[PDB]
Design a protein around this ligand. Structure first.
Ligand SMILES: [Mg+2]
Ligand SMILES: [Mg+2]
Ligand SMILES: [Mg+2]
Ligand SMILES: [Mg+2]
Ligand SMILES: [Mg+2]
Ligand SMILES: [Mg+2]
Lengths: 220, 246, 203, 234, 246, 196, 241, 111, 237
């Protein structure tokens, strides 16, 4: 998996590759790694896929209740504290590793979080098996005060680095753009640089190719 | 106090539930009207001081994106039910199915909560009746009343609280099964105008609708399959607008 | 590991206004084949669930889901849809995060309202494979991946989908010591479901 | 008549701030038979009058050893006395096992107080309806304590509790200057005690059957005399 | 006043129609039957004194100590049902130890005051207990100097220059007030000791029928290094002689 | 990690490197190991980042509660709270924490709490993987009652050397200054400290 | 039962709650809270007649958090029970959610605890009215007040006490005239002065520095005034030469 | 890895005569090759003419003797100072020991 | 003292149970009639306004599973609690045995829950009476009632709620020991017609009968218009 986060002058951008792997096998070639905690708070996950998805949902649910209760827009720091405290309580055994990004009434935020419950903050971050390739790009091309279009390009280049160089990563780029003062902009398959070429033939069998012992109608 | 405080009397009636209803009957009028393309729920905002800011309180509450509620009776009982109702929608439904509960089942959970207060040791029943307006994909629009007993009934239209007898009557005359949301809103206003003693504007009236999905209230774009919320509360401005050209 | 003691496979595929789901019939204990009739595919209303892995959990999950869906139908007053059932399976599995059922479930079905074909897979703790061409599971999942990626094409008619998912299952199974020993195939459309028992090698 | 409205439980003050359930508990002691305690600087002594149910029955024990250097006598509810003296035995024992330390009599009284107090402030139970006279010999010498149902424990040179106990208590006040000086002379301290309890007899006499005596002091472990052991003093 | 609140004075934590808790006020009547106790805040410390009634000559002198220490730096004296007083001090000892365990520094006096207060008011919350039948005078030295407090059966407490409770409290308060008026520049600890003895002596005229014994303690920066100590030996006798001269 | 805290004439200064590694990968090159738990009570973190963040968080909560109830907590009290958490959970923490504060009476204070949860008040303290290399340097260069500038220099020189020898240390040098005048944050970049 | 525990009377009323309201006037002192442009001021009478008291320990104002102040109308021990609870809630909130508890959120929370005592038989209501103030990071200057019924609401301004209708009407009149919902002064001192002046007016009494206590919320913190600062305020409004 | 057990050496010896019994022990207490004490008694008079030694891990031995002496104290409280007979002491010591069957006193007891 | 729910009166009577029964005698009437080849459940609705949403509700009859339904009389919210435990009990039995639950076994369990509240715990009893209609292969078609006493009995025909004695009399009059499910329907409608204090909007109706297509058992919760069309054909139009 390759996920990154990139802050820009007026918001934050999050991005991920789209390959999920059962061992050295690809189960899903067009998976969705960009999850919504709340309308303007989004997160990308690596590590144990079930933990990443479950913990996303748990906090999202609670953030929603919190928001309804307090009559306030959910804050990224709230997702942060709730997640890290939950992950810490479980002493690493929930193998979630997340980059969480967002905008809220206090501004725009970017955090990473690891299974044991530790968190970092910065202007650009990466996680997952392809994070070294992505971080090499970020370390080469980041600059302060990116425009939206520049942070999209940079984050998208970083995911690409993992797609091309990390066997753990592949297929497409997904981005979400969270700008201050606007609706979060989720771009599913922003890039699709890995379409299968046309096969050499169709493998449709002539009807009756397959031997049947018995047949019957099932009633729903 | 590990015993029921609601018990049967020789006439078979349960006093604490009856007295709970009395509290409800004493509350500010609120009402609901079901249209063909929506539902409306409404109430008056009696401010118990002019120095109070009534906007900081909300008698009409969003429960899910497609379900809202209003009440007559004891406000704090209501506030607390609202908190419980939002949570049970996540804990017994959304976290299992990844979907918000349909209206009738969420009504059913709140009913359970209220029934329990009429049987468990050491507690009085809730002193509110709720009207609950919702939409769901397989039942469409609905409207329910829940009582302190935990009983609930589906309505085409009804009123509760102080001026409910006249309001139910007014609603009987004006209601037909072809109202569009806008008719139902209009009728709700005319109805609330009888009950309202004192000021009557967008600032003493609370009003919400369950209607069409609002993609503009979603907060994000990109998932086209993602439905906007059907619940919307009307602004002060929007309510006054209708009031002038009443 | 528990997920390879009993053996067996499941595969599901989408086609034009149809879905299909298939499984082998084997239940063994390591190298000893024991049952020649252990089907791995169940249904709750119009939603199909296939399950590979530890046979005792296969059976347990079935009963658990029949239980849950029956209550659903009673309370909701309508039968559960494949999308909703998929989430239910996920959360039921995750509930046992640290002592999981050793299974690889697969869901197939057609939404009664959209008429849209639906499939999904899960890891043993509920992670959802949202993929919508094919889903594979079991001790020959490698073989199945290979067969499906090769044989599959989208929008097959049911009669053609039947040949495709059959050949995928049959050929994957014959390269796996722990799978095979018979098979069943369901072709599912809106108004009709056909179950078929395939002829295959018995070694 | 008015008291009737405020005396239902130990958790209710009367309008003058009485706890009648605790006051009633005090009355339970008067249903017991008399017991006396007294002391000098070297010894502490208990004397009890034991009751029988009739001529076919035994006489009921009134004196309970709690440790080598501590014991008590009781008047009132027998079960209560069993509960509170077992509690004391446990506290003495705890002091020994953990600290290799004899529980001071003053500390024994405080522990007893706190336990009884709790019964007077919470709904559910009742005050203890028994009186205890506690004697001991610790690092600060010889001691006598009186325990009340209210939990209150008082350190005294001498006292008496139970039915008709006023006579003995008057005699002990009257003889105070003398008995507190009986040092190195245990039989003489006992004689003073028997004499005191005698003031509480009404047309009845002290016998080898009804008279119980206890003593503790310097080099003298807590010892209980009954039966023929009391004859020399009769 | 209606001293007896008929129908509302039969169980603790019940509000009378005028918003009183009669059980708490009754608990106060028991405090008023207790022996007199006082506290005097002085320049760098605090002093405590109590009247001890010699009910019988059978009491052994200088035993039956009433003033209690909490931690090493706090004194407590109370009037009323003495065992309620020990009960409260036991709680204070745990609270103090618990504070000292987490935070290392000895519990500050206002912090200690509030622990006792919350515990005492917690006993006005439920009918399953009764209020404390003591008023407690207590305090000591901390990083902020000398502090003296009095705490009533209601849980109410405040800081004081001088405090008196028990049977002879009116007399004592009057002398405490003269003392205040007469010493705007302050009172040394030694002075406060003597003055305390005088005051207990004057208050005793309410229990004049019985003899009494005087008990005095203090906590002072210069005299006891901010630890609680019982006033004994010459200083005690000097105060006893002084009190008697008046 | 290379963390230290140094009392001086006007208060106390905390210093730290900014490197967090997992394996040989620098997961964060600009970590902020200088963590605030009250106004003029801060701490330096070494060990498991999950553990030290989790500890500091709960300690900040305890001191917030302390403040609303009892008033301003002392530096010692903060060290007490850390110690209690580190000692009691010793079997499940890897935390090496230096607690440092200012107040008007003591001026600057420093308490180091090593693995295991013992606590030691000191005129200065060094900790973390990188501190081993600077024991001799710090011993020979520390004086009591240095000025602010002399103290900044001592730490800059100290941590520069620890960063030089320790693979687990590097990045920028962070400093926090606690005095009567308030709280000041400093930063020094490789091109400055690497020349000393 | 219905005169003793929180169960319904036949008129659907809760007597113990009603009686709990009566308790709130027992200390016979009034408070008022007013909002400025950028501050919130709370003011309450202070009556310390017994000369043996340390007046500096007599207070019905409490610093709940760095930003939230509270003033209570009612007996001090119920007052201090609530104050302790709110302080704990506010700390827990910051720990769990990673930001400072808003004033209205703390008020709602305490309102809910309060409604629970009206529903569960074994707990009695607190006999108190809690006025919460802050300059909230999102809502600006804020006043939220809770009662023994579990009710709360936000206020432009408010007053609580035996003479609360007097002070209330004094404020309403001013806010009618003024056409804004707060006092247009940036200086918290001028806002405090305003509040003292209008309380003097409504109660028909003058005040010395010992007759009141004052809390002030700003964006940075909530704080209380020493008797010395209060005096300085009293001088600012002195009309005699 | 905490080892809760130790070995303190020592040897004990009981012989019964017709109208007497003898319980002997050495007074040396050891840890590995060191001498902790040249005189630390390990045979104890427990009252009622009962003598006892619990030899091996001295911490368990002391604990066991302590518990037994206490057992006597309570026997006397319960039965008006009735002598605990030796066979009765033995059965009781059986129960003290088997009470810790899954974390035993690492000692050899003689009475 | 009759406030206390688990103590005997001096006549060995249980007051709260008796008063709960009084409450039920004021609820909407429910009938159940067993035919040779089916069962009929009918409930007259307590509440009537013209604004009540009569379709999409059914709040007196409830499916417990494919083979068993109940008719309620009493607090509807009380009922829902017990209905939900029953549906769960039926599913547990199916999960344990892989068979549908025998009607009497489901009935006995709910009766036991009701009984419990009468002997321990200090909580008021549920204010509901149930008529259970069900089929199983052991006993075929069955009809039971249960009440807050926790007692249950089997019936060939029965009523609960208001005017019960009037209803019982009519049923005693026109019940043949082996009728046909279509007649039992007619009888049910007539009997509710003779005691109503009667239109489709005030009725809920259900049947359990051999599907005739084929050999299987079917539960029909009649829709409002279905109730209309069956109200005319039996001459109550
Ligand atoms: Mg596999
Ligand atoms: Mg094979
Ligand atoms: Mg073979
Ligand atoms: Mg380095
Ligand atoms: Mg209550
Ligand atoms: Mg024997």
């Amino acid at each position: 998996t390759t996920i990154v986060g990139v802050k820009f002058n007026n918001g934050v951008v999050i991005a991920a590759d789209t390959r999920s792997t059962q061992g050295p096998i690809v189960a899903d070639k067009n998976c969705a790694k960009l999850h919504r905690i709340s309308p303007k708070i989004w997160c990308a996950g690596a590590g144990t896929a079930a933990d990443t998805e479950a913990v996303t949902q748990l906090i999202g649910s609670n953030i929603e209740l919190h928001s309804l209760y307090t009559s306030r827009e959910p804050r990224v720091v709230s997702a942060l504290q709730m997640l890290k405290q939950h992950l810490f309580k479980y002493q690493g055994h929930i193998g979630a590793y997340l980059i969480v990004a967002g905008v809220d009434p206090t501004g725009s935020h970017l955090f990473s979080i690891h299974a044991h419950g530790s968190t970092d903050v910065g202007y650009y971050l990466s996680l997952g098996s392809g994070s070294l390739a992505a971080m090499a790009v970020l370390e080469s091309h980041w600059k302060q005060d990116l425009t939206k279009e520049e942070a999209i390009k940079l984050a998208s280049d970083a995911i690409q680095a993992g797609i091309w160089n990390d066997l753990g990563s592949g297929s497409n780029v997904d981005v979400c753009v969270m700008e201050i003062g606007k609706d979060a902009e989720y771009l599913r398959n922003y890039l699709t640089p890995n379409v299968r070429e046309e096969k050499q033939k169709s493998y449709k069998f002539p009807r009756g190719t397959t031997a049947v012992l018995k047949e019957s109608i099932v009633n729903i | 106090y590990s015993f029921s405080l609601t018990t049967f009397s020789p006439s078979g009636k349960l006093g604490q539930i009856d007295y709970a209803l009395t509290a409800v009957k004493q509350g500010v009028t609120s009402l609901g009207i079901k249209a063909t393309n929506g539902v409306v729920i409404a109430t008056e905002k009696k401010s118990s001081s002019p120095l109070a800011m009534s906007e900081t309180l909300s008698k009409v509450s969003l429960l899910t994106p497609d379900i809202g509620a209003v009440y007559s009776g004891m406000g704090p009982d209501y506030r607390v039910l609202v908190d419980k109702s939002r949570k049970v929608a996540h804990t017994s439904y959304k976290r299992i199915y990844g979907e918000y509960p349909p209206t009738k089942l969420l009504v059913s959970e709140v009913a359970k909560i209220m029934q329990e207060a009429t049987q468990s040791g050491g507690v009085r029943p809730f002193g509110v009746s709720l009207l609950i307006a919702g939409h769901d994909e397989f039942n469409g629009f609905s409207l329910y009343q829940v009582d302190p007993s935990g009983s609930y009934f589906p309505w085409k239209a009804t009123a509760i609280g102080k001026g409910s007898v006249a309001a139910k009557t007014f609603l009987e005359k004006r209601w037909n099964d072809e109202l569009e949301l806008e008719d139902a809103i209009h009728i709700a206003l005319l109805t609330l105008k009888e009950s309202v003693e004192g000021e009557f504007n967008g600032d003493t009236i609370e009003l919400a609708i369950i209607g069409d999905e609002n993609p503009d209230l979603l907060g994000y774009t990109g998932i086209p399959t993602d439905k906007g919320p059907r619940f919307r509360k009307l602004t002060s401005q929007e309510i006054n607008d209708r009031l002038e050209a009443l | 590991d528990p997920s390879s003691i009993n053996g067996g496979i499941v595969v599901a595929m989408t086609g034009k206004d149809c879905v299909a789901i298939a499984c082998d019939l084997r239940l063994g204990s390591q190298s000893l084949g024991v049952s020649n009739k252990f089907e791995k595919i169940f249904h709750y209303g119009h939603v199909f669930l296939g399950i590979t892995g530890l046979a005792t959990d296969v059976t347990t999950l079935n009963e658990m889901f029949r239980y849950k869906t029956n209550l659903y139908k009673l309370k909701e007053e309508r039968a559960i849809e494949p999308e909703t059932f998929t989430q239910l399976v996920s959360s039921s599995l995750y509930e046992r995060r640290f002592g999981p059922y050793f299974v690889g479930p697969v869901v197939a079905g057609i939404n009664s309202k959209s008429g849209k074909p639906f499939i999904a897979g899960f890891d043993l703790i509920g992670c959802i494979d949202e993929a919508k061409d094919f889903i594979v599971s079991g001790t020959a999942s490698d073989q199945l991946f290979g067969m499906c990626e090769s044989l599959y094409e989208p929008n097959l008619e049911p009669e053609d989908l039947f040949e495709t998912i059959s050949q995928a299952l049959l050929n994957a199974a014959d390269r796996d010591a722990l799978s095979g020993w018979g098979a069943v195939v369901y072709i599912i459309k809106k108004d009709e479901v056909v179950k078929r028992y395939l002829k295959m090698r018995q070694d | 008549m008015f008291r009737n409205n405020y005396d239902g439980d130990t958790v209710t003050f009367s309008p003058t701030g009485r706890l009648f359930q605790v006051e009633y508990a005090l009355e339970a002691i008067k249903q017991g038979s008399v017991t006396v305690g007294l002391r000098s600087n070297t010894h502490a002594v208990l004397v009890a009058l034991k009751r029988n149910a009739d001529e076919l029955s035994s006489y009921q024990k009134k004196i309970i050893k709690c440790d080598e250097h501590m014991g008590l006598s009781l008047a009132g509810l027998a079960p209560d006395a069993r509960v509170l003296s077992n509690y004391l035995r446990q506290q003495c024992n705890y002091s020994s096992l953990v600290f290799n330390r004899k529980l001071a009599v003053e500390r024994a009284g405080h522990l007893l107080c706190d336990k009884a107090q709790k019964n007077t402030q919470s709904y559910g139970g009742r005050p203890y309806g028994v009186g205890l006279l506690i004697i001991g010999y610790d690092k600060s010498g010889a001691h006598l304590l009186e325990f009340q149902p209210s939990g209150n424990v008082t350190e005294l040179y001498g006292t008496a509790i139970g039915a008709r106990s006023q006579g003995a208590k008057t005699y002990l006040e009257r003889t105070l200057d003398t008995f507190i000086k009986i040092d190195g002379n245990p039989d003489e301290l006992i004689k003073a005690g028997v004499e005191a309890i005698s003031q509480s007899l009404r047309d009845e006499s002290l016998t080898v059957d009804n008279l119980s005596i206890a003593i503790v002091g310097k080099d003298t472990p807590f010892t209980i005399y009954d039966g023929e052991a009391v004859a020399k003093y009769i | 006043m209606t001293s007896i609140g008929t129908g509302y004075d039969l169980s603790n934590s019940v509000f009378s129609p005028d918003g009183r808790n009669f059980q708490v006020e009754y608990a106060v009547k028991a405090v008023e039957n207790g022996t007199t106790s006082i506290g005097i805040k002085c320049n760098d410390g605090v002093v405590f004194a109590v009247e001890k009634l010699i009910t019988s000559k059978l009491l052994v002198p200088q035993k039956n100590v009433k003033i209690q220490v909490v931690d090493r730096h706090i004194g407590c004296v109370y009037s009323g049902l003495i065992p309620d007083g020990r009960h409260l001090v036991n709680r204070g000892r745990e609270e103090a130890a618990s504070f000292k365990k987490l935070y290392k520094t000895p519990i500050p006096i206002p912090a200690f005051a509030d622990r006792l207060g919350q515990y005492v008011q917690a006993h006005t919350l439920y009918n399953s207990v009764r209020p404390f039948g003591v008023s407690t005078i207590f305090g000591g030295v901390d990083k902020n100097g000398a502090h003296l407090y009095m705490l009533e059966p209601s849980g109410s407490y405040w800081g004081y220059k001088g405090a008196a409770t028990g049977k002879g409290r009116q007399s004592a308060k009057a002398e405490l007030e003269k003392l205040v008026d007469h010493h705007p520049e302050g009172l040394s600890a030694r002075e406060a000791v003597k003055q305390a003895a005088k005051i207990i002596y004057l208050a005793h005229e309410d229990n004049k029928e019985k003899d009494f014994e005087l008990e005095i303690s203090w906590c002072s920066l210069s005299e006891t290094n901010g630890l609680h100590k019982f006033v004994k030996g010459d200083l005690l006798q000097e105060a006893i002689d002084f009190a008697q001269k008046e | 990690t290379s963390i230290m805290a140094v009392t001086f004439k006007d208060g106390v200064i905390l210093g730290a490197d900014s490197r967090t590694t997992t394996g040989a990968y620098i997961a964060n090159r600009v970590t902020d190991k200088l963590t605030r738990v009250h106004d003029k009570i801060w701490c330096c973190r070494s060990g498991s980042a999950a553990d030290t963040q989790a500890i500091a968080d709960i300690v900040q909560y305890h001191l917030e509660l302390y403040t609303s109830q009892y008033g301003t907590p002392s530096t010692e009290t903060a060290a007490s709270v850390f110690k209690e958490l580190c000692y009691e959970n010793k079997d499940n923490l890897t935390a090496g924490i230096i607690v440092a504060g200012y107040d008007d009476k003591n001026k600057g204070e420093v308490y180091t709490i090593p693995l295991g949860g013992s606590v030691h008040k000191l005129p200065y303290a060094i900790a973390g993987s990188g501190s081993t290399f600077i024991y001799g340097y710090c011993d020979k260069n520390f004086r009591e009652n240095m000025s602010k500038e002399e103290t900044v220099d001592f730490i800059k020189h100290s941590l520069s050397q620890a960063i030089k020898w320790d693979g687990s240390s590097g990045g920028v040098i962070r400093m926090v200054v606690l005095t009567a005048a308030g709280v000041e944050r400093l930063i020094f970049y490789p091109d400055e400290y690497e020349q000393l | 039962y219905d005169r003793h525990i929180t169960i319904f009377s036949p008129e659907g009323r809760l007597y113990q709650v009603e009686y709990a309201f009566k308790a709130t006037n027992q200390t016979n002192i009034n408070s008022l809270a007013v909002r400025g442009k950028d501050c919130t001021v709370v003011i309450s009478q202070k009556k310390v007649p017994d000369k043996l008291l340390d007046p500096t320990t007599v207070s019905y104002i409490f610093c709940i958090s760095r930003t939230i102040g509270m003033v209570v109308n009612g007996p001090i021990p119920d007052a201090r029970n609530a104050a302790l609870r709110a302080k704990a809630e506010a700390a827990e909130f910051r720990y769990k959610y990673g930001y400072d508890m808003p004033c209205d959120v703390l008020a709602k929370r305490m309102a809910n605890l309060s409604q629970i005592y009206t529903q569960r038989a074994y707990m009695r209501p607190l006999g108190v009215i809690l006025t919460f103030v802050s300059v909230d990071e999102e809502l600006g200057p804020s006043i939220y007040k809770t009662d023994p019924a579990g009710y709360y609401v936000g206020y432009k301004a408010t007053a609580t006490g035996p003479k609360q209708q007097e002070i209330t009407t004094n404020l309403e009149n001013h806010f009618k005239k003024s056409k804004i919902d707060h006092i247009n002064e940036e200086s918290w001192e001028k806002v405090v002065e305003f509040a003292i002046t209008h309380m003097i007016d409504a109660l028909g009494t003058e005040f010395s520095k010992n007759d009141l206590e004052v809390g002030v919320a700003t964006k940075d913190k909530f704080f209380t005034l020493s008797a010395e600062n209060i005096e300085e305020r009293l001088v600012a409004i002195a009309e005699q030469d | 890895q905490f080892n809760p057990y130790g070995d303190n050496g020592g040897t004990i010896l009981g012989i019964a005569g017709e109208d007497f019994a003898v319980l002997a022990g050495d007074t040396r207490n050891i840890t590995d090759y060191s001498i902790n004490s040249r005189y630390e008694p390990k045979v104890f008079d427990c009252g009622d003419n009962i003598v006892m030694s619990a030899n091996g891990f001295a911490a368990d031995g002391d604990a066991l003797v302590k518990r037994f002496k206490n057992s006597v104290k309570w026997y006397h409280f319960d039965h008006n100072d009735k002598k605990l007979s030796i066979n009765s002491a033995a059965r009781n010591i059986q129960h003290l020991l088997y009470g810790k069957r899954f974390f035993p006193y690492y000692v050899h007891t003689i009475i | 003292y009759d406030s206390r729910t688990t103590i005997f009166s001096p006549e060995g009577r249980l007051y709260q149970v008796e008063y709960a029964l009084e409450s039920i005698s004021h609820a909407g009437t429910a009938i159940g009639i067993m035919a040779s080849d089916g069962i009929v459940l009918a409930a007259e609705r307590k509440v009537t306004s013209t604004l009540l949403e009569q379709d999409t509700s059914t709040e007196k009859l409830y499916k417990l599973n494919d083979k068993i339904a109940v008719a309620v009389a009493g607090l509807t919210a009380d009922a829902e609690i017990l209905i939900n435990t029953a549906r769960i009990h039926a599913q547990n039995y199916l999960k344990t045995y892989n068979e549908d639950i025998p009607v009497e076994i489901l009935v006995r369990r709910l009766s036991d829950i009701k009984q419990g509240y009468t002997q321990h715990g200090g909580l008021r009893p549920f204010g509901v009476s149930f008529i259970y209609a069900g089929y199983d292969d052991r006993y075929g078609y069955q009809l039971y009632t249960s009440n807050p006493s926790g007692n249950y009995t089997g019936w060939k025909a029965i009523s609960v709620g208001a005017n019960t004695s009037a209803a019982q009399t009519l049923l005693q009059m026109d019940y043949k020991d082996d009728m046909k499910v279509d007649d039992a329907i007619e009888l049910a409608l007539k009997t509710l017609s003779k005691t109503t204090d009667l239109t489709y909007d005030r009725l809920e109706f259900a049947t359990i009968r051999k599907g005739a297509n084929d050999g299987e058992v079917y539960q029909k919760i009649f829709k409002p218009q279905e109730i209309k069309d069956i109200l005319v054909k039996t001459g109550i139009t």
